Design a protein around this nucleic acid. Sequence first.
DNA 1: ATCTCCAAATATCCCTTGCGGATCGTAGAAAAAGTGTGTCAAACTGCGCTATCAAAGGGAAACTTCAACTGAATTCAGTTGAAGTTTCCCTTTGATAGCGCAGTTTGACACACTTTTTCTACGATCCGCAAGGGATATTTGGAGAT
DNA 2: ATCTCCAAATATCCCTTGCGGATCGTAGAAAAAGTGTGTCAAACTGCGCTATCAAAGGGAAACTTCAACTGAATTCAGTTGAAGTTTCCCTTTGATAGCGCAGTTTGACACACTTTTTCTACGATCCGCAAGGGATATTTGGAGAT
Lengths: 97, 98, 99, 94, 103, 105, 83, 78
Amino acid sequence: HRYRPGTVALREIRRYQKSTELLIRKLPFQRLVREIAQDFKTDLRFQSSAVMALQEASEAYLVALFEDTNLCAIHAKRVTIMPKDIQLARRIRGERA
Amino acid sequence: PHRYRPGTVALREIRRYQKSTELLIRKLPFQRLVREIAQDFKTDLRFQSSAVMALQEASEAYLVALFEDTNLCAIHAKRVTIMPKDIQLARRIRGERA
Amino acid sequence: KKRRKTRKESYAIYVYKVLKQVHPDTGISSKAMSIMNSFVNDVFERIAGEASRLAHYNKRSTITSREIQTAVRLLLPGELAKHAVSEGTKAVTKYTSAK
Amino acid sequence: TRKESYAIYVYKVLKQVHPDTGISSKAMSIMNSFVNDVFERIAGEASRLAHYNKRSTITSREIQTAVRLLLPGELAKHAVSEGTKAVTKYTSAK
Amino acid sequence: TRSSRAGLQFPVGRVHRLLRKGNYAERVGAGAPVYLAAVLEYLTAEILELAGNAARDNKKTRIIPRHLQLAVRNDEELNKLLGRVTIAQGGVLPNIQSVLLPK
Amino acid sequence: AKTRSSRAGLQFPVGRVHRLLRKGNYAERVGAGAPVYLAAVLEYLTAEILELAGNAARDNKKTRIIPRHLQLAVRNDEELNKLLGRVTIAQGGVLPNIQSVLLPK
Amino acid sequence: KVLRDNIQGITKPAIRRLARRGGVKRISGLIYEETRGVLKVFLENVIRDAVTYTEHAKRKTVTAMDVVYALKRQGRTLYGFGG
Amino acid sequence: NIQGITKPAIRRLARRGGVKRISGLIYEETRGVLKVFLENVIRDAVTYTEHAKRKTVTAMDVVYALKRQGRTLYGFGG
DNA sequence: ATCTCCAAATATCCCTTGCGGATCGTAGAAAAAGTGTGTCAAACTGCGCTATCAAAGGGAAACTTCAACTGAATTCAGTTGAAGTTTCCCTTTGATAGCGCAGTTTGACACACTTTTTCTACGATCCGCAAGGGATATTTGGAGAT
DNA sequence: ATCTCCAAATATCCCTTGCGGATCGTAGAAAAAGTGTGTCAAACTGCGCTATCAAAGGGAAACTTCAACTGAATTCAGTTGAAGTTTCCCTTTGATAGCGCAGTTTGACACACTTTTTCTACGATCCGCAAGGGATATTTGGAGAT
Ligand SMILES: [Mn+2]
Ligand SMILES: [Mn+2]
Ligand SMILES: [Pt+2]
Ligand SMILES: [Pt+2]
Ligand SMILES: [Pt+2]
Ligand SMILES: [Pt+2]
Ligand SMILES: [Pt+2]
Ligand SMILES: [Pt+2]
Ligand SMILES: [Pt+2]
Ligand SMILES: [Pt+2]
Ligand SMILES: [Pt+2]
Ligand SMILES: [Pt+2]
Ligand SMILES: [Pt+2]
Ligand SMILES: [Pt+2]
Ligand SMILES: [Pt+2]
Ligand SMILES: [Pt+2]
Ligand SMILES: [Pt+2]
Ligand SMILES: [Pt+2]
Ligand SMILES: [Pt+2]
Ligand SMILES: [Pt+2]
Ligand SMILES: [Pt+2]
Ligand SMILES: [Pt+2]
Ligand SMILES: [Pt+2]
Ligand SMILES: [Pt+2]
Ligand SMILES: [Pt+2]
Ligand SMILES: [Pt+2]
Ligand SMILES: [Pt+2]
Ligand SMILES: [Pt+2]
Ligand SMILES: [Pt+2]
Ligand SMILES: [Pt+2]
Ligand SMILES: [Pt+2]
Ligand SMILES: [Pt+2]
Ligand SMILES: [Pt+2]
Ligand SMILES: [Pt+2]
Ligand SMILES: [Pt+2]
Ligand SMILES: [Pt+2]
Ligand SMILES: [Pt+2]
Ligand SMILES: [Pt+2]
Ligand SMILES: [Pt+2]
Ligand SMILES: [Pt+2]
Ligand SMILES: [Pt+2]
Ligand SMILES: [Pt+2]
Ligand SMILES: [Pt+2]
Ligand SMILES: [Pt+2]
């Protein structure tokens, strides 16, 4: 038995728009924060909640960006999000020149 | 009689209006609109002439910027022609509502 | 004792009172409590911030209930602004009654 | 009544930088907006910094990190350095 | 307490202290904390009102962050007020664009 | 050397900046170096814009600086442009710029 | 005397000139009424705040500074009229 | 480290976002975008840390930093 | 439009843990009281905003003609998604080692405050003059036409 | 390929104003100088919590397999908006005069502040028990096949 392309996708959309769980695995993301902080100031520690803060903020940001990117895709009679969609989303937001 | 191709005058107009800085909305019309709107909020308001000029500077700036973004939306959709859905898209993404 | 573990200060108990007032059989998780505590601080600053500017703009040295009111009118959207101006005006009417 | 303005200091700085160049009155008005604008952003963030750190006073330190927070990359470096250099020179006097 | 004289749950005395410590102005009138406390109370009343209902609709007796998010995003005016805010652990409103659904 | 500007080596007015920090309810007290550091920063940024606007007036065969020169200055400079990303310079116009696809082919 | 329908003072040529400054080459016929809507909502928002500032000052004349402060509030800071 | 943000993770994010079909080039772009984002916030978070003469980045330092970028977050000490 | 067939939804029971009440104890709010100064009410005023008019003319409205753009229709290589197998690392759990945050105490010094002396900067005003900016004519780069 | 022609760019003269450089005289504000006072820098200290570690299983990420369906290219015709023309409305300009009200001024004081003792609300810390978590079964809402 096969589900048509797009059907498990739509199922996934419904699932995740219902949950509140973080969708990035905690440890890879934590390594990323420390790598980045390290480039600004060396010998730094983090309260556990601060990484948490950064992951809530990071994910809310990205989720909100895919909403915007998705609309741009649809604006172009497409259904697939592409880099040019993120780029336009970010430009119209004034995040990017 | 001589006749320019469509788009030729449009391009030359873009150059003209991008070189210059004068207010593009007429002055008396704009002031009537402000007074009308002010009135629905409060009767008996008066305006410093420069308060209206500030409003007009801010409004022409806002719209000129919105048309920049509207154009990016038309071009994104492989069109050269701006349309209502382009502005709606620009305004949605900018986070403007109402 | 002797070394005291400081003292955090929140609106958690006033938020709990108001929640009772409106949903007596409903309760609230500590995470959601924390969110309401942020909201109150966030709004307090947004308001006190405008009031402060209004007082400066008009060359005055005091944040009165008049500045809070117009701060609120600037900060809050349509219907929320209208209700908030009621509840605020009413509290002050009532507070100055009581002596 | 007196209307305070940065116009004289802006002329002075303009003469240092472009000695045969003038400034129209509107252009001056913008420059005066720019200075009050930036002053506000800096004193504002400096104010938060002192509150965040339970402190009663605004010192050049807060102005400095407010600058680092507000100005973009290369502009923060030069302003940080023009600023510390003026304070050093100022202490070296009295 | 000034809170009782004013008919409020929210602490008129604290709000008053907090106004004097925040360097908002040289002086704080006597009416100003009352009106502020009152407004803080009204708005926290208004969120919890809608958030509670969202706990009902979702069959719960405890309000969690996701109910605050549904309260907020489903209400036009609060959505505006919190336009630039993210509620940790709130997730998003269920929304799927028309053209993505099958015919 | 009398004035605090002269002392600090500055054109911008340390005395005025001190007073405005005090009468603006930013904090109870204001350190001695603060208005110095801050007047120095205000002077640097105005010198960087006037410099860049100056060039723009000269490129447009002009002797006197107008708002369009400030506008051209700010928006052709990645960093000033960002600092004033949310600002409108009255009577500045926009940068000349026409997307490619609209050019005659 | 009654003020009515003034957004039609924002004419078709005027909207076109603004599009030109914005680099717009071709404008669909429906744009002009969308643009009036937008401008109206823009002005209602700024003016609302300008007028609140005015009412607070116990004034009847709306000043450049009320408009300048209103725009700052909306995050649309304006240089050239004070502040 | 930036590859720790894995393809399937970006897909979950995109799905909460309401995205049905994702082009293969999207996964690199998002990684670029997240890096720029995290950099800006951490730059400011660390600025606040240094100023407090601390060696530990706190939740508040982050909340302050997100407030500065105009991205107020509730639930961690707002 | 009617039968087979998943995955999500709902039902149900047993375990886990964080709500939410209760105990206790302090930091801060309240009461009471002497103190001055910002605010307010009320008098007076002339900048400048509203209103009007009249004339000139720049520009808007309404119209015809048609070039070219939008979008409907068609085709299809290929990029994705669904699902299967394989490989890898994340999460949990149980502490132990110790960094460094934040509590406590304090006096030296730096900043506030307030009075007198000193001079900077703003408001009001003239002036050489190149900078413009406008009204009028001509030349020029290149779109469109022959 | 070469000519024709139109609007923007350049050239000419004239003249208005807004500027920059004086000189002025004059209110307010900076500085100089003295003194009262609380903030905060350092130094020493407890322990909360970040870092780390070691292991082991479970499930997630990676990689593989296939072909469904999507995006991107091509072609075309009817639609529609640009260009240019004509008519005359209404905006702009310049001045006018009346006066509504913004903003300055001045005395009287209610009202906020600040200091000190008394009353007490709300923070910290505690944990029994039920709301919710998680595990398993049964139902229901659809998708995909024929
Ligand atoms: Mn009306
Ligand atoms: Mn109820
Ligand atoms: Pt002003
Ligand atoms: Pt905090
Ligand atoms: Pt607990
Ligand atoms: Pt005590
Ligand atoms: Pt006490
Ligand atoms: Pt007084
Ligand atoms: Pt007095
Ligand atoms: Pt005429
Ligand atoms: Pt005419
Ligand atoms: Pt004409
Ligand atoms: Pt095919
Ligand atoms: Pt194929
Ligand atoms: Pt492929
Ligand atoms: Pt230990
Ligand atoms: Pt240590
Ligand atoms: Pt320390
Ligand atoms: Pt002491
Ligand atoms: Pt000339
Ligand atoms: Pt000229
Ligand atoms: Pt000219
Ligand atoms: Pt030619
Ligand atoms: Pt040609
Ligand atoms: Pt002048
Ligand atoms: Pt001048
Ligand atoms: Pt004087
Ligand atoms: Pt001294
Ligand atoms: Pt002391
Ligand atoms: Pt295993
Ligand atoms: Pt497994
Ligand atoms: Pt397609
Ligand atoms: Pt055709
Ligand atoms: Pt048409
Ligand atoms: Pt036309
Ligand atoms: Pt008169
Ligand atoms: Pt008045
Ligand atoms: Pt007095
Ligand atoms: Pt249960
Ligand atoms: Pt349950
Ligand atoms: Pt459950
Ligand atoms: Pt069924
Ligand atoms: Pt069924
Ligand atoms: Pt079916």
